Amino acid sequence: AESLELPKAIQDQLPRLQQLLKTLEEAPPVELQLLHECSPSQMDLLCAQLQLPQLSDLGLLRLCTWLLALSPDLSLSNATVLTRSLFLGRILSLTSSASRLLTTALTSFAAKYTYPVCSALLDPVLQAPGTGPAQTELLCCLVKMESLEPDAQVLMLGQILELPWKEETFLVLQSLLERQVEMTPEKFSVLMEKLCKTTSMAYAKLMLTVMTKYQANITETQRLGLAMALEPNTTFLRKSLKAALKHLG
């Protein structure tokens, strides 16, 4: 309805692409190489017309294998678009842990496109209503990947801090913070402000990780802020948190 046009070669080769995808459900052909004709907006349109969200798990894994062999590499933004089209709907639809094939497809694609996969799925997954352990376990796994390099971890931390904070975010953030990711004092200030401003075990563990792994960054005002956030007897991990707090004094 928005009338964006696919690149000429793509419009022309489109039944061939639909053909190839069907075979995957039954080394990449040059037709897949045509993905490079697309801007990311065109890639989004193309993915929808290919009906990528509707591939079987097997078709998905096979297509990911082909995508991983593409040379040159997909650009950051094109890889971001493809990731969402390939995986977002499937992940959001989970009511149980991801199948072996889904997990294999996602992790092998992320092993190469680590930052693009993580940045592509983090926001929409966390911002979706009713996101649960089946969704957060995959996000936790992504952010723990050894191939998510130190600078990409810094970038993901910045992205997580900008999200509204609820239990699912606490889990993913704690997983990333366990890796000892560096933060500018400005980012650390945001983290502390949100932390100091609760009933869950996930919030307790997040708090504990921050107080123990980032002790060197905690200012006296932040310490007092933590002190206030801890007073009540309703909180989880009271004893460990009090101990961690006393250590900062």
From Swiss-Prot:
Which cellular compartments is it found in?
Nucleus
Give the record's PTM text.
Phosphorylated. Phosphorylation by CHEK1 at Thr-65 and Ser-93 regulates its function in DNA cross-links repair. Ubiquitinated. Phosphorylation by CHEK1 induces polyubiquitination and degradation.
Give the recorded effect for residue 65 to A: Non-phosphorylatable by CHEK1, not polyubiquitinated and unable to complement the mitomycin C hypersensitivity of cells lacking FANCE
Q: What does this protein do?
A: As part of the Fanconi anemia (FA) complex functions in DNA cross-links repair. Required for the nuclear accumulation of FANCC and provides a critical bridge between the FA complex and FANCD2.
Disease linkage: Fanconi anemia complementation group E: A disorder affecting all bone marrow elements and resulting in anemia, leukopenia and thrombopenia. It is associated with cardiac, renal and limb malformations, dermal pigmentary changes, and a predisposition to the development of malignancies. At the cellular level it is associated with hypersensitivity to DNA-damaging agents, chromosomal instability (increased chromosome breakage) and defective DNA repair.
Subunit-structure text: Belongs to the multisubunit FA complex composed of FANCA, FANCB, FANCC, FANCE, FANCF, FANCG, FANCL/PHF9 and FANCM. The complex is not found in FA patients. Interacts with FANCC and FANCD2.
> What name does UniProt use for this protein?
Fanconi anemia group E protein
Species of origin reads Homo sapiens
